[PDB]
UniProtKB/Swiss-Prot annotation:
It comes from Homo sapiens. Its main location: cytoplasm. It catalyses: [protein]-peptidylproline (omega=180) = [protein]-peptidylproline (omega=0). GO terms for biological process: activation of protein kinase B activity; apoptotic process; cell adhesion molecule production; cellular response to oxidative stress; endothelial cell activation; leukocyte chemotaxis; lipid droplet organization; negative regulation of oxidative stress-induced intrinsic apoptotic signaling pathway. SUPFAM superfamilies: Cyclophilin-like. Its EC number is 5.2.1.8. Keywords: Acetylation, Apoptosis, Cytoplasm, Glycoprotein, Host-virus interaction, Isomerase, Isopeptide bond, Nucleus, Phosphoprotein, Rotamase, Secreted, Ubl conjugation. This is Peptidyl-prolyl cis-trans isomerase A. The modification N-acetylmethionine is found at M1.
């Protein structure tokens, strides 16, 4: 009946920065939304708490969710190491969009990105499953620690995360 909301509390070299919350589009991409919800709560015994944003390209996006290898080579879903592209209904319409990173068709795990620009070239090959609800300003503050090749100048972490309400 109503889409779930999750939060990240972000820190920069261990110092609190602020809270980002996300609406998850369970009404359109239930399986993909549920994966991200569950990794956010930690209810399977693993998830996003303590993981880093390993690649931030200002004017493009912030990428994270690699809680196994910390560098963009890892992660897993709650269904198995990988799961399918659920659908490509939703498009990358502008800043704030939450979408799955991948390495080929039907290779989703835990890695995700938050768009800081419209990224229409990703439509139809990356599954869009949510958007930033509050704290887009905190995403903009994070983005400033990225660089052209994505390497971050300070360590950007999910200090805490879970489900709101
Ligand atoms: C060097 N490196 N840093 N991170 C990665 C991770 N990665 C591959 C990958 C994704 C998900 C799983 N489960 C396993 C692997 C990746 O960034 N794939 C591309 C991708 O998903 N995206 C989404 C937005 C940014 C990035 C991208 C997509 C398309 C063009 C450029 C770029 Br950069 N690899």
């Amino acid at each position: 009946m109503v889409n779930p909301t999750v939060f990240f509390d972000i820190a920069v070299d261990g110092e609190p920065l602020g809270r980002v919350s996300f609406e998850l589009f369970a009404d359109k991409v239930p399986k993909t939304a549920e994966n991200f919800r569950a990794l956010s709560t930690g209810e399977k015994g693993f998830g996003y708490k303590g993981s880093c944003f390993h690649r931030i390209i200002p004017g493009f996006m912030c990428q994270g969710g690699d809680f196994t290898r910390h560098n963009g080579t890892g992660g897993k879903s709650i269904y198995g190491e990988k799961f399918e592209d659920e659908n490509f209904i939703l498009k990358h319409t502008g800043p704030g969009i939450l979408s799955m990173a991948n390495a080929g068709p039907n290779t989703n795990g835990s890695q995700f990105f938050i768009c800081t620009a419209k990224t229409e070239w990703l439509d139809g090959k990356h599954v869009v499953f949510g958007k930033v609800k509050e704290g887009m300003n905190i995403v903009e503050a994070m983005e400033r620690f990225g660089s052209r090749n994505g390497k971050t100048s300070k360590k950007i972490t999910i200090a805490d995360c879970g489900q709101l309400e």
